[PDB]
Amino acid sequence: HAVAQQRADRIATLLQSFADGQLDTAVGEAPAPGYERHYDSLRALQRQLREQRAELQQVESLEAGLAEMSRQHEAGWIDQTIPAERLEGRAARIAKGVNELVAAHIAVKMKVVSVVTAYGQGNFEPLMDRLPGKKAQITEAIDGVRERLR
Amino acid sequence: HAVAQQRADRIATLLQSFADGQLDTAVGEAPAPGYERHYDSLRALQRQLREQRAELQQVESLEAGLAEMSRQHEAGWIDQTIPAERLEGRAARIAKGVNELVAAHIAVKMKVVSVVTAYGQGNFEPLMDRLPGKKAQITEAIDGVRERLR
Ligand SMILES: [Cl-]
Ligand SMILES: [Cl-]
Ligand SMILES: [Mg+2]
Ligand SMILES: [Mg+2]
Ligand code: NA
Ligand code: NA
């Protein structure tokens, strides 16, 4: 009678904690045989709430990292990247993905600058890369510059 | 005796479902007064598991969208963007953030191409934007091209 209520209150308290976002309490083992199923599920649920909390926090950090990277680049510090090494899982892969895509565009941009700077110096040895898709328009444009400049 | 066990099994089953990822069952209301706390928490937990599931799915979609955008740009279709409008919350903001940052770099790149293309035609009216930070190196480079070309 007394124990039954106590064990019931314990389960209510643990569930209440989960609901309120208090995931630090250690669930532990069941008090008696008839509560094994309840506790098995409670422990499993807790592990899941903790994992999802961590993953969602990583995403929040990813948004802040992107925000700072954007701020840095608008200020001209284009070497700045999102510190993917400080993230993990999917958040880290997305961060690396953004860094690589931005880096790829910067590389094409600097290639253009490098080639035309040379033409400006009378050095016509360099040729713009042969780009695909819409980027092919850049290749033709720069070739046109070369032909006309000399 | 019979009812007690039945109501206890119901709570075990609901918790078991949550654990296994079956969040579609409708919890409903408590069967008797002494179970109000349990059910209140169960409903709240379910709402949270569903919300976190949705948010994590959005992130998975964000990673795929970035992957496809990267694939498209490497192929030269640089007008392609991550469809942020099809996402929501933080996932959507990150997507828009990536689209804007990439677009900003492309704009600087095309500005460079536009200016030098003009110089190649003997049209020295356009001047490269005055860029900050490390980007200032691009401004000086292109100015140098202008001065030397004419
Ligand atoms: Cl720096
Ligand atoms: Cl297209
Ligand atoms: Mg010269
Ligand atoms: Mg000319
Ligand atoms: Na990617
Ligand atoms: Na941003």
The DSSP line for A125-149 is --------GGGHHHHHHHHHHHHHH
Give the whole-angstrom CA distance, residue A136 versus residue A143: 11
The length of chain B, given as a count of residues: 150
Paired tokens of B78: 């640089």
Compute the distance between CA of residue B91 and CA of residue A56 in angstroms, rounded to an integer.
11
By what method was this entry solved?
Answer: X-ray
Contact A105 B109 (CB under 8 A): yes
3-state DSSP call for residue B50?
helix
> Looking at residue B103, which CATH number applies to its domain?
1.20.120.1530
The resolution in angstroms reads 2.0
Q: Which of B120, B59, B132 is nearest to B89 (CA)?
A: B59
Task: Find the domain containing A85 and state its range.
Answer: 1-150
**Inter-helix orientation angle A36-74/A2-20, to 10°:** 10
Torsion, CA B59, CA B61, CA B62, CA B68, rounded to 10: 160
Q: Which residue of B has its CA nearest to A19?
A: B45
A99 CA to middle of ligand 6, Å? 13
CB-CB contact of A42 with A54 (8 Å): no
- Please give the tally of structural domains in chain B: 1
**For residue A75, how far is its CA from the centre of ligand 1 (angstroms)?**
11
- The amino acid sitting at B94 is I
DSSP assigned state of A150: -
| Cα–Cα dist B8/B35, whole Å | 10
Dist. CA A128 → ligand 3 center (Å): 19
Instruction: Judge contact between A118 and A125, C-beta under 8 A.
Output: yes
Q: Which of B135, B114, B112, B115 is nearest to B124 (CA)?
A: B115
What phi and psi values does residue B131 have, to the nearest 5 degrees?
Answer: -90, 150
Cα–Cα distance for residue pair A42/A11, rounded to 1 Å: 9
Give the Cα separation of B145 and A132 in Å (integer): 27
Tally of CA atoms within 13 A in the half-sphere of B147 that contains its CB: 7
CA distance B75 to chain A (A): 6
Is B148 within 8 Å of A121 when comparing Cβ atoms?
yes
Cα separation, A17 vs B64, whole angstroms: 35
Q: Do B74 and A19 touch (CB under 8 A)?
A: no
Give the whole-angstrom CA distance, residue A55 versus residue B59: 10
- A31 within 8 A of B10, measured Cβ to Cβ: no
- How far, in Å, are B27, B78, B85, B87, B97 from residue A62 at the CA level? 35, 24, 19, 16, 11
- Please provide the distance, in angstroms rounded to a whole number, between the alpha carbons at the two ends of chain B: 100
Q: Which helix H or strand E contains B100, and what residues bound it?
A: helix B89-120
Is the CB of B73 less than 8 angstroms away from the CB of A48?
no
- Would you tell me how many other CB atoms lie within 10 Å of the CB of residue A130? 10
C-alpha closest to that of B130 among B108, B104, B100, B102: B108
Q: How far apart are CA A57 and CA A63, in angstroms?
A: 10
Listed residue (A146, A128, A116, A127) closest to B138, CA to CA = A116
SS3 B91: helix
- Quote the CA–CA distance of B77 and B22 in Å, as a whole number: 41
> How close are the terminal C-alpha atoms of chain A, in Å?
100
**Closest CA relative to residue B18, chosen from A79, A41, A7:** A41
Degrees to nearest 5, angle at CA B59 with A17 and B27: 40
